[PDB]
Amino acid sequence: TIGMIALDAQGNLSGACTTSGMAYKMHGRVGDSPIIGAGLFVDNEIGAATAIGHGEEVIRTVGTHLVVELMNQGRTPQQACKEAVERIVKIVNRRGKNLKDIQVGFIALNKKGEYGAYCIQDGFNFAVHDQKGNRLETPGFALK
């Protein structure tokens, strides 16, 4: 999967997600990538988010909608990604599953062009390009 979100010179947001899905899935399986609110969500008054990780888990937690709603409540992008992942870890525990079996993460942008990222597990990186150029950054992660 690749997810991409941008803020243009007009101050408008957009995003895109595209994937071949989980290798060797059952025929007809759909993950989070084509689901608005799951894989991708964009609200030009607030911010945008896109997801990584096991698709089934992003779908069950409506994850990008959650991230953008937390930004709407006043969280910065980084705070929103973290707090989304923290809610999601609680839900994994409620489920009785092993956190090591579940990866969910988010990248996020607001209307200021502030950005953030957080995941359950270490191992993910994301690329950021602004007027200071293009670079690969690593996010915070909950499972330490």
């Binding site: 999967t1 690749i2 997810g3 991409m4 979100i5 941008a6 803020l7 243009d8 010179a9 007009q10 101050g11 408008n12 947001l13 957009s14 995003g15 895109a16 997600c17 595209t18 994937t19 071949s20 899905g21 290798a23 060797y24 899935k25 059952m26 025929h27 007809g28 399986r29 759909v30 990538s33 084509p34 689901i35 608005i36 894989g39 991708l40 964009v42 609200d43 030009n44 945008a48 896109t50 990248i107 996020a108 942008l109 209307k111 200021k112 062009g113 502030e114 950005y115 990222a117 993910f124 990186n125 994301f126 690329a127 950021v128 390009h129 602004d130 007027q131 293009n134 670079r135 690969l136």
Partner: protein, 141 residues
């Protein structure tokens, strides 16, 4: 305000970002930048989790999912679409050219063909061989 700015997922995000930045640095629209950006990875057969070169389903079929969302709640999505290399652009067409927001399956492909997209074989030799390898290790039939 720090703009323009683009973020994308994984190390191949770095390469997508370059494409997006060709639009964004010239004052182009975010929607155009994100579509260009992700199409790079769809097009690249060595990127085996997106588009062409994608690892198939357990039955050896490469089925693609994508969605797009602009600055004013316009959205389009395709899911479980075969044979089209650039599902982000089909999604864009669902958004712009239909009264719907999500097409799946054979209907998504039919609509793509109606918009001038062409059937292509998305299963690479490399992906077919690995699939065959998995059929043995997993013993799936």
């Amino acid at each position: 305000t720090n703009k323009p700015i683009v973020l994308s997922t994984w190390n191949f995000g770095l390469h997508a970002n370059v494409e997006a930045w060709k639009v964004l640095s010239k004052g182009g629209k975010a929607l155009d930048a994100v579509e260009k950006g992700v199409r790079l990875v769809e097009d690249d057969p060595t990127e085996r989790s997106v588009g062409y070169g994608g690892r198939p389903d357990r039955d050896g079929r490469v089925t693609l999912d994508a969605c797009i969302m602009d600055e004013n709640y316009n959205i389009g999505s395709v899911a479980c679409m075969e044979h089209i290399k650039n599902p982000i652009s089909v999604a864009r067409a669902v958004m712009e050219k239909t009264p719907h927001v999500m097409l799946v399956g054979d209907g998504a492909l039919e609509f793509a063909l109606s918009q001038g997209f062409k059937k292509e074989n998305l299963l690479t030799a490399e992906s077919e061989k690995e699939w065959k390898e998995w059929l043995k290790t997993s013993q799936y039939k």
